[PDB]
Design a protein around this nucleic acid. Structure first.
Length: 96
RNA sequence: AACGGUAUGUCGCGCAGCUACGCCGUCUGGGAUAAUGGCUGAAAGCCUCUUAAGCCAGAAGCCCAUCUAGAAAGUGAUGCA
């Protein structure tokens, strides 16, 4: 029984497109010339994603939600923050 | 005597047939689950297997694969009529 939104600033030097709940993050290195691309279907967690070209930010919003559905705003930006570090620098897991 | 009868003759061995006390087969990988263990991750700027979305691993159990029956599941392809 409440109406609100939260935002997240994707930086410069990293392209994205968002359509039908499918977040396609991608990155281009200047020197070595290697594209990288990550895609995830987020049709579940029913939230309105939008990409603001002006602020290069992604905004998500949760109308009329229970406290279970407000968690999904934070879970979106949990995945997307890993996606930006995953495409640019790349995750290693040292184990021995 | 030979070759037979009768005592549903007794003893010895005995193919065929059946039979065990004999002989051969019982291979083999999925899928979704139950308990439970994990990954990423909010709610709760920390932290958590989800007590939230999403993902993985998972029982002699359940469903497939295999095997038995099978179109009054009144079916079908091909020969003639």
């Amino acid at each position: 029984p409440v109406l609100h939104q939260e935002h997240f600033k994707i930086p410069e030097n990293i392209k994205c497109t968002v359509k039908s709940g499918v977040v396609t993050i991608e990155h281009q290195d200047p020197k070595d010339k290697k594209t990288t691309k990550l895609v995830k279907d987020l049709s579940h967690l029913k939230l309105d994603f939008e990409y603001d070209e002006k602020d290069h930010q992604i905004v998500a919003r949760c109308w009329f939600g229970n406290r279970k559905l407000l968690a999904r705003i934070g879970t979106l930006f949990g995945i997307v923050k890993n996606m930006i570090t995953g495409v640019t620098l790349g995750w290693r897991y040292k184990m021995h």
